[PDB]
């Protein structure tokens, strides 16, 4: 009493879309379309480290800070049309929960409903991209630091 043939057609189409989306982003060119993040042709920036220890002992551990994001976003040329950024939801959550010395936020300072819906027109969030935090297990207070060379976000 159910249309199993139509269900299978829909399932096959859904699988095709899901695989195509992973391709064009990470696929290699041997049997799948080559993705931009795998080709790695876009110029890259490298976040500055931090000496978390003492001046007498330079530790130079990796770190990520809000003004690094600000510099990255403001460094894009204005000639190249209208830019849009792509990133991961965990990264957005990490970015939106930073606080200054007085304990108040510094992104969406006075908003009680800050959410990706507000900035949807400049920032695109998809969970298929690499996640530097690895399920909120790195970068926080008391946790192991980030891993050098990790992907954070791309703009183009």
């Amino acid at each position: 009493n159910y249309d199993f043939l139509s269900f299978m057609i829909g399932a096959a189409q859904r699988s095709h879309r899901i695989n195509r989306n992973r391709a064009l982003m990470v696929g290699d060119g041997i049997n799948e379309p080559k993705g931009w993040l795998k080709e790695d042709c876009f110029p890259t920036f490298l976040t500055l480290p931090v000496n978390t220890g003492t001046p007498e002992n330079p530790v130079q551990t990796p770190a990520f800070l809000a003004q690094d994001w600000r510099r990255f976003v403001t460094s894009f040329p204005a000639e190249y049309g209208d830019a849009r950024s792509v990133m991961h939801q965990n990264v957005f959550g990490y970015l939106a929960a930073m606080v200054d010395a007085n304990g108040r936020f510094l992104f969406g300072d006075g908003d009680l409903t800050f959410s990706p819906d507000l900035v949807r027109e400049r920032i695109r969030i998809s969970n298929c991209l690499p996640d530097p935090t690895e399920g909120n297990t790195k970068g926080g207070t008391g946790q192991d630091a980030f891993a050098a060379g990790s992907f954070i976000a791309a703009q183009a």
């Binding site: 959550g93 929960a97 930073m98 909120n136 970068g139 926080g140 207070t141 946790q143």
Partner: peptide, 27 residues
């Protein structure tokens, strides 16, 4: 050869896996 079908559990989570939230970002 037989293929078994099994429900996840009679209750959605008899002991609900209430978990701590991600720790807050550094200063």
């Amino acid at each position: 050869m037989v293929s078994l079908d099994c429900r996840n559990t009679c209750a959605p989570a008899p002991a609900s896996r209430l978990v701590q939230p991600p720790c807050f970002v550094c200063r």
